Amino acid sequence: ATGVALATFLQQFNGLAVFTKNTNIKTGIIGTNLRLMLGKIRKWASDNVGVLFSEF
Amino acid sequence: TTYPVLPYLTNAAYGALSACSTCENPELNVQGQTYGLLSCINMPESCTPGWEFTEVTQLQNNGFVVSGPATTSGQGNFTSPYIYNDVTNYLRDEKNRPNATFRDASSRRLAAATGVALATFLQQFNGLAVFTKNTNIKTGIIGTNLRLMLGKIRKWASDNVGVLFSEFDNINEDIQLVSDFDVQPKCVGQPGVFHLNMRYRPPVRGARINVNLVPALFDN
Amino acid sequence: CNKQNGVKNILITFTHCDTGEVIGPISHEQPDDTLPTYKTCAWTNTALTNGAVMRSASNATMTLPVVRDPRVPLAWYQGCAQIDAQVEKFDGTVMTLTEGAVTEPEESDGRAVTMTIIAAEIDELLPPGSLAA
Amino acid sequence: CNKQNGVKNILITFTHCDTGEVIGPISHEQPDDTLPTYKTCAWTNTALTNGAVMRSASNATMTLPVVRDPRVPLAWYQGCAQIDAQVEKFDGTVMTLTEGAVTEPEESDGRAVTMTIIAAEIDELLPPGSLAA
Amino acid sequence: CNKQNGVKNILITFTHCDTGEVIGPISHEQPDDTLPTYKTCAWTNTALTNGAVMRSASNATMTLPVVRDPRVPLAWYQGCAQIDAQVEKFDGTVMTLTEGAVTEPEESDGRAVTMTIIAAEIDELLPPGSLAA
Amino acid sequence: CNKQNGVKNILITFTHCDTGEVIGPISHEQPDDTLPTYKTCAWTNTALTNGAVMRSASNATMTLPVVRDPRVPLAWYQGCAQIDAQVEKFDGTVMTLTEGAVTEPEESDGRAVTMTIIAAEIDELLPPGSLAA
Amino acid sequence: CNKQNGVKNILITFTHCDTGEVIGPISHEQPDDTLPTYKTCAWTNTALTNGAVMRSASNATMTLPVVRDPRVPLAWYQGCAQIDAQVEKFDGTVMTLTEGAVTEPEESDGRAVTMTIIAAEIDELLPPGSLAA
Amino acid sequence: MAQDALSDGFVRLCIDPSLNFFGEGCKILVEGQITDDATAAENVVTCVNSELDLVE
Amino acid sequence: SDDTDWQENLRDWIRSAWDCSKPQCFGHGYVFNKGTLGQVLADGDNSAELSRLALP
């Protein structure tokens, strides 16, 4: 169940602009970078404590 | 060999999807279950995929577009296919060197759009006085010279990062402008003729995520 | 480049409550020098006598002054839409807030907007080398 | 000329309440540098505990400082008339309010007037190329 | 170097209330020129008539503006952790507070924090040669 | 010749905001020995304490004293038109600015004009053989 | 010569904050007779009454006028880079600054730049035979 | 095909409870006697990966 | 069925359905084993993919 649930979440980054090297995103662009992706993943993991996961 | 649909219908659906209904913005990739679904084609469900996964990998790695159904079952109901990779048949190079410059079909659209846009921008220098021996422009004259033109072109290139280009590796070596008198031997050059060399990259987008999942158990 | 204080990136995602339309994570900028402010601890303490306190639930809050995007209706930055925001700093901190709610908006001239967002929790991602769990 | 921030036009229309007299859409100007402000979301969120809010009806409001017209009586810019206003910006945004009602009028010196108008809805017309339906 | 006024050292210790994790006495600095303030007498006097007062319990309080440590979560400087503090001045005074409770935090920009701590007692260590037992 | 300091060419292009009329890149001159000055870094730092700084957006600016062209209205050098400028030095540096806005003009006698221009970016083109990428 | 007062060598190193590019310790020169000025004490005293002072923390600063190097962008001498400077005098003193920040630049003509650099500390290396440990 | 969430191939999932994220810490050498029934080569420094390869 | 060889083939199939070489299908299989205590313990091939119903 966790494999499928995590696979569905990560779909939102498919086709999304990725910025590396210079990580400043010009105003108006739709994109992300490593640190923001990690923050979103951590937030999703935290939200699921009680359903799929025990405390980390 | 066992494809259960009339081959030309799938080709027509793919072309129609990739041509107009999607690509009025040239940077979009026609893939996935959302942006690459051929909703006008229906085929029965089957436990057999037609291509084994190793065969799919070979076809993808050898410049062929592969597709598969949106859902699987043995009941035989109708389903629509979708495109796995929106790729051209490009491999190697005009100098016989393997690279991925034109691997994605969106690269061709972006190249055409960049050519057209750069053509439109440069029109402002058509019929504008040019000074090439003494580069001082008297007061009141409407004209320009090489260095000012190169500055304008560099500004234009910089203003298009994030729309048409990824960040330049080195703007000072990627854009170069030269006049004909500098190239052709003495007495053979022509007035008001220029040579421009520009190197660019297309924007990058998310492609794959490799997930390692390591279950454990409550302890301590 | 180590001790710089400021905002580096802001991403906001909109979801319309009435119809469910979604607009992806657009990059934003700021109208002036005022930085965003946070409160990431849900509970609240009230002072009794002799050093004792009273503990209650309360919320986690963010204040986000940003320049409006010309492609989004002004009503969406006010209470008519749901907001998911991320803010990144030069030192590496990232604050993530999802499923926020904008409370008691004030009038805007049409360019600068100051949202007051409340969420159940806010996630803080410190630079590498933290001491907490 | 793209990033200019200001007001380009203001057309106001007056309908006298007690007798029904009407005066066409006269063009107005501003007394100083203060721009009009808007709230175009006709709902309000009040913060409860644990990220929950309470939603209520409220109104849509506009604050419009202008210079009085020497032909329109001063009583009409106060609560004695009904107002239909449009404001256009240099970027191309147009805000249309109809059937307004001036609330709690303040004292005026006869030249500069500041009206607080409320309406059921305010329309916003963004420049071409919007993302919201 | 006898008449100098200011803060020489600040040491804080954190104990998480929910899980019990502890972080040792980290040294802190200050964001600007505002010094900490103290109120060490527990009782409070309210003025009656004819020179009489009413005595009640109240608390001992400290106000501590410090720059956050990048290794500790921001929620800990707010009401989500227990604080033990010592402040040493240039003249020799040491103010020791233990088992503090942070009350009614305000929003922070992420670098500067101004805690408000209440404790049952505060200990004052004067320079050598005091007059009070 | 390698170490001469001065201005070699100035080209300006005008675009009227209200009507869109354009005047090609006319060649200009200077009224006296003062040279134009630039700020090409679109950020600002503030001191704080202990070596830290606060970093904010600000602008990129140019100051351009020129002799007016007798074929252009004086109002176009003031804030009633949009400016696109390039300045070339004797050593080989070219500074290209586009989409400029003239802020707070002062009064002119009709021959010499000093323009304060702001922009999002300014492009600097160094002589051949630079080190920065 | 023991009693010559002047600057003998200036070396600067540039690190680009956004991309991390570096340029080695180039040798620089001055545009005019003005010499660099320093403040190597990191505290400040404010005068109270009766001979008392208030002591608080601040920055160590350096003012450094130099002639730009034609191989480095002008934006780097302004606030878009991190700077490591060393200045050697004729008498033997050497002042070393590392990890400095350039604060509130002024517009430059493209040849001479005056930089105000702040750091946490500045090292001083007196000629042989000092009295202070 | 497999499952819908994992079919498109954007997310490539691996589940292995024996993996480790830790990097290589610096090294320790242990020197001692062996017996004739050991299969290790005498007087040769070799790496040890777990407690269970021992004895043989 | 009670044939060990057939059960091992099914176990290998379930292994295949979980392998990282290609998109996964998952699943879990149920089998039984009848015999004496010393015989039933001889069928424990560390199969995480099977639930073995021991019977006397």
The DSSP bridge partners found for residue F14 are F23, F83
SS3 call for D47: strand
Residue D121 token pair: 């809805």
DSSP-derived letter for residue B123 is G
**Whole-number Cα distances in Å, G70 to A26, B172, F10, G112:** 29, 14, 21, 11
Q: Which of D94, B169, B66 is nearest to F132 (CA)?
A: B169
- Sign of CA pseudo-dihedral H35, H39, H42, H47: negative
| Chain A residues inside the 8 Å CB shell of H13 | 3, 6-7
**Whole-number Cα distances in Å, G126 to B34, E62, G42, G122:** 71, 45, 19, 13
The contacts found for B55-61 with CB under 8 angstroms, 24 or more apart, are B56/B84, B60/B84, B60/B85, B60/B87
Residue B50 token pair: 């037609």
Does A33 reach chain C within 8 Å, measured CB to CB? yes
Q: What residues have CB less than 8 Å from E23, skipping those under 6 apart?
A: C131, C132, E13, E14, E72
Residue C84 token pair: 């998911």
Q: Report whether G59 contacts G42 (CB < 8 A).
A: yes
| Chain B residues inside the 8 Å CB shell of H9 | 84, 208
D95 exposure class (CB count in 10 Å sphere: 0-12, 13-18, 19+): buried
| Chain C residues inside the 8 Å CB shell of E110 | 35, 37-38, 89, 93
The string over G97-122, giving b where at least 16 C-beta atoms fall within 10 Å of a residue's C-beta and e elsewhere, is bebbbbbebeebbbbebebbbbbbeb
Beta strand A17-18 with A31-32 is parallel
Q: What residues have CB less than 8 Å from D55, skipping those under 6 apart?
A: C79, D43, D44, D45
Q: Which of B19, E57, E133 is nearest to C49 (CA)?
A: E57
Q: Report whether E101 contacts E118 (CB < 8 A).
A: yes
* Residue I6 backbone dihedrals phi, psi, to 5 degrees: -60, -40
> Under an 8 A CB cutoff, do F54 and C5 touch?
yes
CA B164/CA B109 separation, integer angstroms = 11
Q: Which of F109, F40, F26 is nearest to F72 (CA)?
A: F26
| Chain E residues inside the 8 Å CB shell of C39 | 78, 105-108
CA C104/CA G23 separation, integer angstroms = 51
Residue type at position C54: M
- To the nearest 10°, the Cα dihedral for F50, F54, F59, F64? -20
CB atoms within 10 A of CB C107: 15
Experiment type: cryo-EM
Does B61 reach chain H within 8 Å, measured CB to CB? no
Angle at B169 (CA atoms; ends B165, B171), nearest 5 degrees: 80
Search chain H and give the residue with CA nearest B45: H1
- Sign of CA pseudo-dihedral B183, B184, B189, B194: negative
DSSP-derived letter for residue B125 is G
> Under an 8 A CB cutoff, do C37 and E109 touch?
yes
| Chain C residues inside the 8 Å CB shell of F52 | 3-5
Beta strand B143-144 with B81-83 is unpaired
CA C105/CA C85 separation, integer angstroms = 17
> Under an 8 A CB cutoff, do A4 and H11 touch?
no
Q: Do chains I and F touch (3 or more CB pairs under 8 A)?
A: no
E101: left (phi over 0), alpha (psi -120 to 50) or beta: beta
* Residue located via tokens 């993943």: A41
The DSSP bridge partners found for residue E101 are E118
Residue I51 token pair: 């639930």
Angle at B219 (CA atoms; ends B214, B220), nearest 5 degrees: 140
CA D122/CA C73 separation, integer angstroms = 12
Q: Report whether D84 contacts D100 (CB < 8 A).
A: yes
CA B100/CA A21 separation, integer angstroms = 21
Residue E104 token pair: 């009614």
CB atoms within 10 A of CB E41: 10
SS3 call for B61: helix
The chains found to touch F (3+ Cβ pairs under 8 angstroms) are B, C, D, E, G
CA G62/CA G85 separation, integer angstroms = 9
Residue D70 token pair: 């020497």
Residue type at position C126: L
Chain A to chain C, count of Cβ pairs less than 8 Å apart?
56
Residue C127 token pair: 């630079």
CA G94/CA G123 separation, integer angstroms = 8
| Chain H residues inside the 8 Å CB shell of A4 | 3, 5-6
CA B62/CA D58 separation, integer angstroms = 63
Q: Which of I14, I16, I19, I20 to mutate to test the interface with H (most CBs of H within 10 A)?
A: I20
* Nearest CB neighbour to I23, from listed H7, H15, H16: H7
* Residue located via tokens 């007016």: F68
DSSP-derived letter for residue B32 is T
How close, in Å, is residue E74 to chain G by CA atoms? 24
Residue type at position F1: C
Quickly count helices (H) and strands (E) in chain G. 1, 10
Does C88 reach chain A within 8 Å, measured CB to CB? yes
Residue length of chain B? 220
The contacts found for E7-12 with CB under 8 angstroms, 24 or more apart, are E7/E35, E7/E36, E7/E87, E7/E88, E7/E89, E7/E90, E8/E88, E8/E89, E8/E90, E9/E86, E9/E87, E9/E88, E10/E64, E10/E66, E10/E85, E10/E86, E10/E87, E10/E88, E11/E85, E11/E86, E12/E66, E12/E83, E12/E84, E12/E85
Residue A28 token pair: 């108006």
Q: What residues have CB less than 8 Å from B219, skipping those under 6 apart?
A: none
The string over F52-90, giving b where at least 16 C-beta atoms fall within 10 Å of a residue's C-beta and e elsewhere, is bbbbbebbbbbbbbbebbeeeeeebbbbebbbbbbbbbe
CA E85/CA E88 separation, integer angstroms = 10
Does H50 reach chain B within 8 Å, measured CB to CB? no
CA C104/CA C108 separation, integer angstroms = 13
- To the nearest 10°, the Cα dihedral for C47, C53, C59, C62? 50
* Residue B202 backbone dihedrals phi, psi, to 5 degrees: -85, 165
CA I23/CA B54 separation, integer angstroms = 12
Q: Which of B57, D95, C35, H1 is nearest to F57 (CA)?
A: C35
**Whole-number Cα distances in Å, F87 to B148, F35, F78, F94, G71:** 8, 11, 19, 6, 18
How close, in Å, is residue F38 to chain G by CA atoms? 5
Q: Report whether B79 contacts B71 (CB < 8 A).
A: yes
Q: Which of B83, H8, C123 is nearest to A11 (CA)?
A: H8
